[PDB]
C-alpha cells in the first residue's frame, strides 16, 4: 500500500503539461476522479456511472520516481480524490515555477480513507518556504476496481479522421472550426457528419439550423457517419485538442463518438481517450 | 418481419375500412385546400391514428412531411407553457416552400398540420390556450385532435373542431380487412372464424389482428396443417368456456352463499378476467327466454353497476362475488 512519486515539471515539460491536460479535464468534467496506480502506468478516470467518460494513460517514466507496492495484482491501488484540492495544489506549483524555481514534488501516501502528502518547495527573491498539503482520498476496493473498465470502440467499416496538428497552418483554422459552435448560447445538441473528406457541424432545431463546414484539407488514414452529441462534451473536446498536437477523431453511425488524443513521447506514449455516448 | 398490426397499418386513405363518412371528406379535401380543424374520436383501435398519418402523407409527401407536420402525443410534455410557446411558435411559422417534385406530385396545401394525439389526457388549462391559436393562424396552420373520450375535450375546443366519429369495427364492416390479411398470410381458418375474432374483440381491429396472429403462430408451431377452429380463438382470447360459465349459472340458481363463495374462490384461481365473465353472463341472461321482464330489468342494472365498478380498477373477486350473490337473490 506504500505509494510514493516524484514529479519535476521543469525537467520534462511535455509529460508535465500532459499531467496539466489530464487534471484540467477531470476538473472540468465532474467532481472527484479515479486514479489507478498500476506498477508500470497510471490512468486517471472520471466515470459518471449518456455522459462521457475519459480514459487517459500516463506511463511510469513521466515521473522521476514511481515506487508502487501493494498486495493486489500488479501493485494496483485505486484512489478516489476530490479534484478541486489537487487542482489548487497543482496551480500553486504552477505559480511556484512561474515565479522562478526548479523544485520537485514529493508525493507520498500517508495514512479506508487516506491522504497524499504533496509537499514541495518555493524560493522567493534565497528563502525557504515549504508548501505542505494533504488531500483526503478514499481507497477503492479491488472488487470495486474491477467494476470499472475502459469503454470498447470498434470500426468494422466506420471512419476515423486524422485531425491536423494545431502547430500547422490549418491547426488554428480547425480550432476555430471546433469553437465556432461554442459561441451560440442556445445550443444543446450538435449533429456531426462523416463523408469519404468533409466533416460538418449541424445543429437543426424547430426554427433555426446551423450547418458549419470545414473547407480545408483533411486526412483519414486506412458511407455516412452521423451522431448527436452534447455541447459540453464538444467544449471538452475543444480543450483536449487545444493541448494536443496528435488528435484522432472517429465517428460511429448513431452509436458513439470517440475523441482520441496522443502525445509521442519517443518510450511509451501518453494517450487520452474521451468516450462519448 | 414485424407484428401484423404494424405490417398491415393503412398507408393511404383507400385502406382505412368502414369509416366511409370521415374518409370521403378528407379525400375531397385533397382536391381543395379548405381542410377544417378535425376532432377524431371513437373507440380504441378504430383507425384514427391510421387515418391522420395517411391523410398527412397524401397531402404533403414524405419530403415535406418533416417540415409541414408537428405531432404531439401524450408521451411528451404538453403543459400550459408548452402550448403557449412551442405550439404557438409552430403555428406562427410561415409555410415552407414545396420543392418542384413536391408540387408536381403531391397537392402541397398552403398550410401545416399540428396533430395533437391523445388530447383527452390534456388539462383544461392547456386546452384553453389553443382556442385562439387555432383561430388566429387558421389560414397558415391546421389542427387535428385525436381522443377516445370526447367529453374530456372542452366545449370551446370541440366547437371549433369538425367532429368525425370513428365507428366501431364489428364483424360486418371490418370482415373484409381481416379476410384480406388472413389470405395474405396464408392463414387457414374454419367457417365461422374471422367472425368470432371480430366479436370477441368488440370494435377493435387491432385486437382482432393480434388474436389472428396469435392463433396462426400456434398453428404453424404444431405443424399438423389444420384449420383454426372457433374454440382455439376463444382459448387464446380469454373467453370463459361454456362449461365453467354454465357451472357459475347453475350455482347461482341455488342461492346458497357458501357454495357460491367457494366456487368463486376456485374460479378466481384460474386467472379469468372478471370483465369477460360479466359480459358472458350479460349475454346469457339477456338472451335467455326463461327469465321474466322484472328479472332482466334488475339484471341489467346489476351488470351495469358491476361493470362500472370494475372499470374504475377495483378488486375482481369482491365485485364478482357481490354480483353473483345479488343475482342469486333475484
Amino acid at each position: 500500500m506504500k505509494l510514493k512519486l516524484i514529479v519535476n515539471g521543469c525537467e520534462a515539460p511535455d509529460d508535465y503539461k500532459l499531467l496539466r491536460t489530464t487534471i484540467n479535464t477531470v476538473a472540468s468534467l465532474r467532481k472527484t476522479a479515479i486514479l489507478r496506480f498500476n506498477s508500470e502506468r497510471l490512468t486517471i478516470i472520471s466515470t459518471p456511472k449518456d455522459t462521457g467518460q475519459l480514459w487517459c494513460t500516463i506511463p511510469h517514466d513521466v515521473f522521476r520516481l514511481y515506487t508502487v507496492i501493494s498486495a493486489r495484482e500488479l501493485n494496483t491501488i485505486t484512489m478516489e480524490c476530490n479534484c478541486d484540492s489537487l487542482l489548487s495544489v497543482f496551480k500553486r506549483y504552477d505559480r511556484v515555477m512561474n515565479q522562478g524555481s526548479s523544485s520537485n514534488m514529493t508525493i507520498k501516501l500517508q495514512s479506508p480513507i487516506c491522504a497524499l502528502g504533496i509537499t514541495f518547495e518555493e524560493i522567493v527573491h534565497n528563502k525557504v518556504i515549504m508548501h505542505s498539503f494533504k488531500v483526503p482520498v478514499k481507497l477503492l476496493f479491488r472488487a470495486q476496481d474491477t467494476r470499472i473498465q475502459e469503454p470498447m470502440i470498434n470500426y468494422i467499416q466506420l471512419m476515423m479522421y486524422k485531425l491536423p496538428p494545431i502547430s500547422g497552418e490549418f491547426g488554428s483554422a480547425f480550432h476555430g472550426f471546433i469553437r465556432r459552435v461554442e459561441r451560440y448560447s442556445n445550443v444543446n445538441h450538435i449533429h456531426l457528419m462523416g463523408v469519404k473528406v468533409e466533416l460538418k457541424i449541424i445543429v437543426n432545431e424547430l426554427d433555426w439550423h446551423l450547418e458549419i463546414c470545414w473547407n480545408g484539407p483533411l486526412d483519414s488514414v486506412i458511407s455516412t457517419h452521423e451522431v448527436i452529441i452534447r455541447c459540453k462534451d464538444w467544449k471538452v473536446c475543444s480543450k483536449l485538442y487545444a493541448a494536443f498536437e496528435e488528435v484522432v477523431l472517429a465517428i460511429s453511425h448513431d452509436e458513439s463518438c470517440v475523441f482520441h488524443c496522443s502525445l509521442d513521447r519517443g518510450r511509451e506514449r501518453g494517450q487520452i481517450i474521451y468516450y462519448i455516448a | 418481419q414485424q407484428p401484423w398490426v404494424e405490417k398491415y397499418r393503412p398507408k393511404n386513405l383507400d385502406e382505412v375500412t368502414a369509416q366511409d363518412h370521415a374518409v370521403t371528406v378528407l379525400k375531397k379535401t385533397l382536391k381543395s385546400a379548405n381542410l377544417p380543424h378535425m376532432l377524431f374520436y371513437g373507440p380504441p383501435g378504430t383507425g384514427k391514428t391510421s387515418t391522420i398519418l395517411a391523410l398527412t402523407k397524401e397531402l404533403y409527401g414524405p419530403d415535406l412531411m418533416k417540415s409541414r407536420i408537428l405531432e404531439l402525443n401524450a408521451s411528451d410534455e404538453r403543459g400550459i407553457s408548452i402550448v403557449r410557446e412551442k405550439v404557438k411558435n409552430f403555428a406562427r411559422l410561415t409555410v415552407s416552400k414545396p420543392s418542384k417534385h413536391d408540387l408536381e406530385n403531391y397537392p402541397c396545401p398552403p398550410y401545416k398540420i399540428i396533430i395533437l394525439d391523445e388530447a383527452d389526457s390534456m388539462t383544461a388549462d392547456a386546452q384553453s390556450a389553443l382556442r385562439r391559436t387555432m383561430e388566429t393562424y387558421s389560414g397558415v396552420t391546421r389542427f387535428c385532435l385525436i381522443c377516445n373520450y370526447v367529453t374530456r375535450i372542452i366545449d370551446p375546443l370541440a366547437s371549433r373542431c369538425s367532429k368525425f366519429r370513428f365507428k366501431a369495427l364489428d364483424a360486418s364492416n371490418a370482415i373484409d380487412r381481416l379476410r384480406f390479411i388472413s389470405e395474405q398470410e396464408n392463414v387457414k381458418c374454419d367457417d365461422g372464424v374471422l367472425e368470432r375474432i371480430l366479436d370477441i374483440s368488440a370494435g377493435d381491429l387491432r385486437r382482432g389482428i393480434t388474436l389472428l396472429q396469435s392463433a396462426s403462430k400456434g398453428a404453424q408451431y404444431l405443424g399438423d396443417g389444420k384449420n383454426i377452429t372457433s374454440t382455439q380463438v376463444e382459448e387464446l382470447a380469454g373467453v370463459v368456456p361454456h362449461d365453467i360459465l354454465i357451472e357459475i349459472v347453475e350455482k347461482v340458481k341455488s342461492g346458497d352463499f357458501d357454495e357460491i363463495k367457494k366456487y368463486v374462490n376456485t374460479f378466481m384461481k384460474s386467472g379469468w378476467s372478471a370483465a369477460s365473465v360479466v359480459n358472458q353472463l350479460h349475454e346469457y341472461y339477456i338472451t335467455n327466454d326463461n327469465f321474466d321482464t322484472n328479472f332482466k330489468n334488475q339484471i341489467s342494472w346489476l351488470l351495469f353497476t358491476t361493470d362500472s365498478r370494475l372499470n374504475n380498477g377495483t378488486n375482481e373477486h369482491i365485485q364478482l362475488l357481490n354480483l353473483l350473490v345479488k343475482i342469486s337473490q333475484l
Binding site: - | 373520450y149 367529453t151 374530456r152 375535450i153 366545449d155
Partner: protein, 319 residues
C-alpha cells in the same frame, strides 16, 4: 368618438355629502374630516357600496391643498411587495411635511386584501414607529385577509349593502343631471337588478338609456336580465319536478348560462337557503357536489342538471 366619461366616473362623488348609504358611517367620516384626528381604519364590505370614494373624499377634505404631497395611494396595480413597504412607504412616513394641527398624512392602501404576508408584517413596524405623522387607511372586501396584528392597531369600519332608497336617491340625482326620461317601474327594475350595487345600477341605467331611451320595465328587462341567483333559488325551491325543470331549461339553459355556473350558484343558494331542514340542506349540498364533480370531469349536460334536480326533489319529498 367623444370625451364623455361613463357615468360611473362622471358621477363619482367628490364630497362626503354626496356618498349615499351607511349614514352612520359617512357621518362619522365627516366628523373625522372636520376634527382632523383620523385613526387607522379598515373599511370593508361588498363591492360597489362606496368604500373607495369615501376614503378618497375623506383624504381630500382632510388635507386640502396638501393632497398631492400628503397622500400615498398604493393599489394592487402597483408592486406592493416587501421592498416597496421597506423603502417607499418608509420614506413617505419619514417625510416631515407641515400640516394644520390635527391633520395627518394618509397612506391609502386600497385592495389591501391582495397584499402579501411579509409586506404586512413590515407594515406592522411601519405603523408602529411612524404613527404620529402618517395614518393608514386600508380598503378591502374581506377583513380576514389582513393579518390580526395589523387589524389590532386599526378601527374596523364595516360598510353594508346599500338599500333600495339610497340607490334610488342617487339614481334620481343622476337622472336629474342627465335629463333622462323614466318611469317608476323601470327604476324599480333597475334597483332590483342592481342587488345593492350602485356601480351596476349606473351601468344598467346608462345601457338602458343608450339602447332605448325611456326607462321602463320592458326596456330594462330586455337589455339587463334578472339576477340568476334569484332564478336558481326559484328552481331549487319548487314543489314538483316538472315545475323546476321548466325554470331550469327555459330560464338558464336557453338563456345562455353554463352548467358549471348553475351548479356553483346552486351551492351558494343552498348555503343561504332558509326555511329548510338541515338534513335536507346537507343532502342537497351533497347532491350538488356530486353533479359538480361530473361537470368538472367533462359531462356538463342538461341531463345531469335534470338528474340533480330529481335527486333534490327525492330528498325533499321523504328523505
Amino acid at each position: 368618438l367623444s370625451l364623455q366619461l361613463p357615468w360611473v366616473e362622471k358621477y363619482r362623488p367628490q364630497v362626503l355629502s354626496d356618498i349615499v348609504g351607511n349614514k352612520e358611517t359617512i357621518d362619522r367620516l365627516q366628523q373625522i374630516a372636520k376634527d382632523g384626528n383620523m385613526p387607522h381604519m379598515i373599511i370593508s364590505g361588498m363591492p360597489g357600496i362606496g368604500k373607495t370614494t369615501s376614503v378618497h373624499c375623506l383624504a381630500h377634505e382632510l388635507l386640502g391643498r396638501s393632497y398631492a404631497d400628503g397622500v400615498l395611494e398604493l393599489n394592487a396595480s402597483d408592486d406592493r411587495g416587501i421592498d416597496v413597504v421597506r423603502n417607499q412607504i418608509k420614506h413617505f412616513a419619514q417625510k416631515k411635511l407641515h400640516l394644520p394641527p390635527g391633520k395627518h398624512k394618509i397612506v391609502i392602501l386600497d385592495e389591501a386584501d391582495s397584499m402579501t404576508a411579509g409586506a404586512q408584517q413590515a407594515l406592522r413596524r411601519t405603523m408602529e414607529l411612524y404613527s404620529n405623522s402618517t395614518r393608514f387607511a386600508f380598503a378591502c372586501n374581506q377583513s380576514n385577509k389582513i393579518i390580526e396584528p395589523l387589524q389590532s392597531r386599526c378601527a374596523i369600519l364595516r360598510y353594508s349593502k346599500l338599500s333600495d332608497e339610497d340607490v334610488l336617491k342617487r339614481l334620481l340625482q343622476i337622472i336629474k343631471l342627465e335629463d333622462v326620461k323614466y318611469t317608476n317601474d323601470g327604476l324599480e327594475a333597475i334597483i332590483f337588478t342592481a342587488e345593492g350595487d350602485m356601480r351596476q345600477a349606473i351601468n344598467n341605467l346608462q345601457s338602458t338609456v343608450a339602447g332605448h331611451g325611456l326607462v321602463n320595465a320592458d326596456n330594462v328587462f330586455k337589455i339587463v336580465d334578472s339576477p340568476h341567483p334569484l332564478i336558481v333559488k326559484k328552481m331549487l325551491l319548487a314543489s314538483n319536478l316538472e315545475d323546476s325543470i321548466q325554470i331550469l331549461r327555459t330560464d338558464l339553459w336557453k338563456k345562455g348560462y353554463s352548467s358549471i355556473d348553475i351548479v356553483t350558484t346552486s351551492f351558494r343558494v343552498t348555503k343561504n337557503l332558509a326555511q329548510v331542514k338541515e338534513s335536507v340542506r346537507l343532502e342537497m349540498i351533497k347532491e350538488i357536489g356530486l353533479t359538480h364533480m361530473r361537470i368538472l370531469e367533462g359531462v356538463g349536460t342538461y341531463l345531469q342538471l335534470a338528474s340533480m334536480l330529481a335527486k333534490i326533489h327525492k330528498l325533499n319529498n321523504k328523505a
